[PDB]
């Protein structure tokens, strides 16, 4: 009964059981289509937005629930809280979106169940951005990451101690390593034969990174496209 | 904007 | 107390060197500074910006001949060598910079030796990244890397299977993954009592995507406010 | 690509 080896065991249990709390699979999910737009691509389908931003705005609050319940979040400064949210809310929304792709019709499947082809999620609000998500999406299959690493993955992206304007960027980074350590060990225990798949996995938050910081773009992008404001727990993450 | 603390409070 | 890794001792050699070879360390250059606007902000100093831009051109020249002395990359096809640095340029070109940070006086150093504030930064061309930028220079200094270390970083960096357009990216898979155990090996022997160093350090390469990512739409802007047109070597970078 | 070309090559 080594200690950390008990200790990170637990840690991936909560991690994994968070993410899976907050975040269907895809499998479970009802999946329904719709024909909004669906033949060629448009500057913008607003009934498509106004869908598209209602279920944004629900996976941002299972996002929070989520950070809730990742050991040490709520022992941050409130304010540090805040900061780490909201530099990582479109990093595990890209993530999250991007584990619900399905090659055979190339679409992408929310959280209930709506599932989008590749030109729907243009015209929702994917925009320029929408080739660069899908080939993310299908970068990720070979991997066969599961509930854990994808939620591993998600709490490393929150859980950084370099993000700007941090109170205790310290102590954000030391919470840090017991995830990167956690993510080592299972990847171990789960791939025997693949040799380098720690810093594969984890490096795929790069991707993530850069997807993130053109998706900044593209909201203020979208900010004077839309002929209205966008919902307003979307607007405060993006401030 | 008050949602993001409503939301971590509750 | 460490096994034997004659190897990868060897390519971690090849490396060190071409990073040295090609980017002078912070006590090897004779600094000097210039009084140009060391005051206050302002929108582009056109002074500062002429030596900048001579400099990057100087500095993308020497990221050339670094990569063509990693073991394997002239193999490729030249389209994937171009693929290769053009995805990589920047991120390498910010990496370089932060490593001559000097915290004292809150400033960095060129390979020339001219050593500008961080006011100085701004007007040369940083503009509204400049903070971005210092911050991560910051960042580096608590994990003591090397010329070892930064080399590998930089070649892992560039060295990239994931890129668009790649032509034999498998072939480029295989170049990365010995760079990988470079790393991790060369961090275990400095530092014995720090296995946590590892993730720490690779995951720098996600934070340079950010910036690298902002940093090219910086490069845009730039565009529209010199005089003339960007140094054609960039341009080729940045294309 | 034609710096980049021929400082390759
Ligand atoms: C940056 C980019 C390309 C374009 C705009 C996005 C966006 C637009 C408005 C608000 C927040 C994000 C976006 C959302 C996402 C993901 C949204 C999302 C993820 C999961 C669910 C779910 O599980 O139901 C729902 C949504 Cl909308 C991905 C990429 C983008
Ligand atoms: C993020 C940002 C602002 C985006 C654009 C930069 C830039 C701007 C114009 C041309 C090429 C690059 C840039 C250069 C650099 C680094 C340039 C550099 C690095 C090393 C040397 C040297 O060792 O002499 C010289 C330069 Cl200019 C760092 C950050 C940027």
């Known amino acids: ?239 | 904007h008050k949602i993001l603390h409503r939301l971590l409070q509750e």
């Open chain 1, 1 to 239: 009964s080594y200690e950390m080896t008990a200790e990170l065991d637990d840690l991936t249990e909560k991690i994994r059981k968070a993410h899976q709390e907050t975040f269907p699979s895809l499998c479970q999910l009802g999946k329904y289509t719709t024909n909004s737009s669906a033949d060629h691509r448009v500057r913008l389908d607003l009934g498509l937005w106004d869908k598209f931003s209602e279920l944004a705005t629900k996976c941002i609050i299972k996002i929070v629930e989520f950070a809730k319940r990742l050991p040490g979040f709520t022992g941050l400064t409130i304010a540090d809280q805040i900061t780490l949210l909201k530099a990582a809310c479109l990093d595990i929304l890209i993530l999250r979106i991007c584990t619900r792709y399905t090659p055979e019709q190339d679409t992408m499947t929310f959280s209930d169940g709506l599932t989008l082809n590749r030109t729907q999620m243009h015209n929702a609000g994917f925009g320029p951005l929408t080739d660069l998500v899908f080939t993310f999406a299908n970068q990720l299959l070979p991997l066969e990451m599961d509930d854990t690493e994808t939620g591993l993955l998600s709490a490393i992206c929150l859980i950084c101690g370099d993000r700007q304007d941090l109170e205790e960027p310290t102590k954000v980074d030391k919470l840090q390593e017991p995830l990167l350590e956690a993510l080592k060990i299972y990847i171990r225990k789960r791939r025997p034969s693949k040799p380098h798949m720690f810093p594969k996995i984890l490096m795929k938050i790069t991707d993530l990174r850069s997807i993130s910081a053109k998706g900044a773009e593209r909201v203020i992008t979208l900010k004077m496209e839309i002929p209205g404001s966008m919902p307003p727990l979307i607007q405060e993450m993006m401030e």
